[PDB]
Amino acid sequence: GPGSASCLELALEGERLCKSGDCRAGVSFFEAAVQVGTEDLKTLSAIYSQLGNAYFYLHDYAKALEYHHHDLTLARTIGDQLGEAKASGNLGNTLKVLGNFDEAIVCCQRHLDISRELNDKVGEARALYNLGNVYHAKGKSFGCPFPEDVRNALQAAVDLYEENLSLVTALGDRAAQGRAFGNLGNTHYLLGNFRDAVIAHEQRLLIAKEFGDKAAERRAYSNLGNAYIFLGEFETASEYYKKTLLLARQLKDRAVEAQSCYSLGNTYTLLQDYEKAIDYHLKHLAIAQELKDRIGEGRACWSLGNAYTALGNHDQAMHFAEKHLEI
Amino acid sequence: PDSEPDVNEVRALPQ
C-alpha cells in the first residue's frame, strides 16, 4: 500500500547515490527499500539487481552473488526473459571473480543465448564481452603470470572479444570498443602474439585519449611497454614506460609512479644504464616506504645491487643487500 | 598487465 510507494522512492535515492560515487550509502537505501518491501515483483527484483551491482562495485562478491541469484530466480518466477538474461550475465561476472569459471561460462552463455533469441544486439555484445572475460580470467589464473587448457581458454577469449568489437563498432560504442581492445590486447599478450598485442593496445590508447580517460591512457602505454620488452625492443619500451610515469605524476598516483619507476629501472638493466635503475629504484624504495610496499625496496635493492655489481659501488651494494636481507 | 573493467547489466527502477 503506502509501502509499495516508499519502496520505490527509497530505491531512487539508492540509485542516485550510486551514480554519484557513493554506493556505500546507496546500498543502505537499497537495503532500506527491501525492509519496507513492495509487491511489484519486477520492482523488487530490480532492487536485488542493483543491490547486487552495488556490492559488486564495493567488492562484496559473496553478497553480490547472493543478490543476483535472487534476481535471477524472480526473473524465472515472473517469466521475464530479459530480466533472466541480465541476471545470468551478472551472476556470470560475479562467479568469474570468485573463480567459478565453469559456472561463469554457463551463466554468460545463458545471457548471450536469450539476448540473441530476443534479437537484442546490445545485450548480445555485452554478453560477448562477459564471456570473453571469463575465458580470459580462466587462462590468466592458471600458473605463474604449459597446460593446453590455458591456450584454449585464451584463444576462446580472442574470438569472443573480436566478435564483440565487430558488434560495438556497428553500434558506435566507442567506450565498449576501448574495453574490448584492452582485454583483447592483454589476451594476445599472454598468448605470445606481441605484434597483435601492440595493434590492439594502440586502439585502446586512441580511444582513451579521445575520451580523456587518463587512467586508461597510461594503462595502454604500460601495456604497450610490456609488449615491446617481449618483442625485444627495449628502447621503445623505455619510451612507453616513461610516458606512463608522467601520467602517474599528474594523476597524483605515487603507486603507479613507482611501478613505472621500477619497470623502466629494470628496462635499462637490459641497456646497461644502471643509473636509470638506481635513480628510479630509489624513487621506488622512497614511494614504497610511503605505502609500506618496502618489500619492493628489497627487490629494488636486489636489482640495484646487481646493477652495482656490474658497475662498481660494491659497498653500496652490500648495504642494499643488507637491507634486502631484512624481511 | 592492467586489464579493463567488468561491465554489469543495470536493471533500472520501473514506474
Helix (H), strand (E), coil (C) string for chain A: CCHHHHHHHHHHHHHHHHHCCCHHHHHHHHHHHHHHCCCCHHHHHHHHHHHHHHHHHHCCHHHHHHHHHHHHHHHHHHCCHHHHHHHHHHHHHHHHHHCCHHHHHHHHHHHHHHHHHCCCHHHHHHHHHHHHHHHHHHHHHCCCCCCHHHHHHHHHHHHHHHHHHHHHHHHCCHHHHHHHHHHHHHHHHHCCCHHHHHHHHHHHHHHHHHHCCHHHHHHHHHHHHHHHHHHCCHHHHHHHHHHHHHHHHHCCCHHHHHHHHHHHHHHHHHHCCHHHHHHHHHHHHHHHHHCCCCHHHHHHHHHHHHHHHCCCCHHHHHHHHHHHHCC
Domain range for A146 is 1-327
Nearest-angstrom CA–CA distance, A205 and A228? 15
Please answer yes or no on whether A50 and B4 come within 8 Å at the CB atom: no
Q: A50: distance to nearest CA of chain B, Å? A: 7
Determination technique for this entry = X-ray
**Joined grid coordinates for residue A144:** 605463474
Q: What are phi and psi of A191, to 5 degrees?
A: -85, -5
Find out whether A204 and A185 touch, Cβ atoms under 8 Å: yes
Please answer yes or no on whether B3 and A186 come within 8 Å at the CB atom: yes
Position A261, amino acid: C
Q: Rounded to whole angstroms, what are the CA distances from A106 to A50, A201, A294, B1?
A: 22, 29, 42, 27
Find out whether B1 and A226 touch, Cβ atoms under 8 Å: yes
Q: Into how many domains does chain A fold?
A: 1
Nearest-angstrom CA–CA distance, A268 and A281? 12
Nearest-angstrom CA–CA distance, A54 and A22? 10
- The four Cα atoms A89, A93, A96, A100 give a dihedral, to 10 degrees, of -50
Give A60-86 as a 3 state SS string: CHHHHHHHHHHHHHHHHHHCCHHHHHH
CB atoms within 10 A of CB A55: 22
Position A88, amino acid: S
* Residue among B14, B1, B7 at smallest CA distance from A41: B14
Q: Sign of the CA dihedral A305, A309, A313, A314? A: positive
Contacts of A47 in chain B (CB under 8 A): 13
Declared resolution, Å: 2.6
CA angle A263, A294, A232 (to 5 degrees): 15
Interface residue A299 vs chain B (CB under 8 A): no
Find out whether A87 and A49 touch, Cβ atoms under 8 Å: yes
**Joined grid coordinates for residue A200:** 590492439
* Residue among A204, A288, A219 at smallest CA distance from A251: A219
Contacts of A176 in chain B (CB under 8 A): 7
Nearest-angstrom CA–CA distance, A239 and A259? 15
Please answer yes or no on whether A183 and B3 come within 8 Å at the CB atom: yes
Nearest-angstrom CA–CA distance, A217 and A220? 5
Contacts of B2 in chain A (CB under 8 A): 186, 219, 222-223
